[PDB]
């Protein structure tokens, strides 16, 4: 596997454990209760790093949707994810070390309802 | 680092991108109206001279005007003192509005 798929799977193994639905993209016949997690496949740069290994930058985005009725709970999900996926993730072939996390929240009215949309981006150095 | 080229191209070309989408939706408006006319004007006197006379023109820059040139066509769109209305351009307004807006969005999304 690429590091992309290794990390993406490790992220599902985490988030899918919370008991909220986790999806890559909602299909039309599929009913999703709020709150729910979107997760998007990592980008990955690679370059030579030592005479014996590559290293690179892998960027993971998970994306949390909830109704705005209770913000403390939504922020509880955001904190619970960041606490589960940092500072480092180990998998079979790759080690991931957090370099940055960026949290951005929007209030979204696209759907005739006031939803909270939090994007969590995490930049991992990888080796 | 060369980003100025991208902004320059946007400044230079998007005029024609908007003009093209307007022209395409104007043509589609006429085509759909020509169909919709026979779709509802079927009380049985049809020569189709109305449908021979739905046209459009580029009446201004980034402005296209569709026009039903047949003289009685208002009486058909709105009805009369003796006739029920059989509206034919209004149902196309409801279509081409959506296509135009979503295609202009897709030019910038």
């Amino acid at each position: 596997m690429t590091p992309n798929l290794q990390l993406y799977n490790k992220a599902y193994e985490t988030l899918q454990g919370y008991g909220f639905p986790v999806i890559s993209r909602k299909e039309m016949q599929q009913e999703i209760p709020y709150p729910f997690f979107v997760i998007k496949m990592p980008e990955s740069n690679r370059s030579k790093y030592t005479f014996d290994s590559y290293s690179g930058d892998t960027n993971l985005v998970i994306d949390i949707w909830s109704v705005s009725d209770d913000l403390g709970h939504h922020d509880g999900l955001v904190k619970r994810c960041i606490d589960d996926l940092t500072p480092s993730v180990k998998t079979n072939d790759y080690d991931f070390e957090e370099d940055d996390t960026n949290i951005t929240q929007l209030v979204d009215d696209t759907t005739n309802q006031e939803l909270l949309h939090t994007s969590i981006t995490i930049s991992y150095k990888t080796f | 680092d060369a980003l100025l080229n991208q902004f320059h191209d946007m400044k230079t070309n998007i005029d024609d991108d908007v003009d093209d989408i307007l022209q395409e939706n104007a043509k589609e408006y006429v085509v759909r109206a020509k169909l919709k006319a026979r779709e509802v004007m079927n009380k049985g006197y049809w020569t189709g001279n109305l449908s021979r006379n739905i046209r459009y023109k580029k009446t201004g820059d980034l402005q296209y005007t569709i026009t039903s040139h047949a003289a009685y066509s208002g009486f058909l769109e709105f009805g009369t003192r003796y006739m029920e209305a059989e509206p034919f351009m209004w149902p196309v307004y409801e279509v081409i509005r959506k296509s135009t807006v979503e295609e202009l969005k897709a030019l910038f999304e």
């Binding site: - | 980003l3 100025l4 902004f7 320059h8 946007m10 400044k11 998007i14 005029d15 908007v18 307007l22 939706n25 104007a26 408006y29 009446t59 201004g60 980034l62 402005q63 296209y64 005007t65 569709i66 026009t67 039903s68 040139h69 047949a70 003289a71 009685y72 066509s73 208002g74 009486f75 769109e77 351009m89 196309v92 307004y93 081409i96 135009t100 202009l104």
Partner: protein, 38 residues
């Protein structure tokens, strides 16, 4: 008879976007000129 024609019109405005783009362009040219001394 009377010429009871019907019109429908589709039209667009770009001139505001045009000026917003000019504003962004000259801001990036500001960056260009300070990067040249750096």
């Amino acid at each position: 008879m009377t010429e009871y024609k019907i019109k429908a019109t589709i039209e667009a405005s770009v001139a505001k976007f045009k000026r917003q783009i000019d504003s962004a362009v000259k801001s990036v040219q500001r960056f260009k000129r300070v990067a040249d001394q750096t």
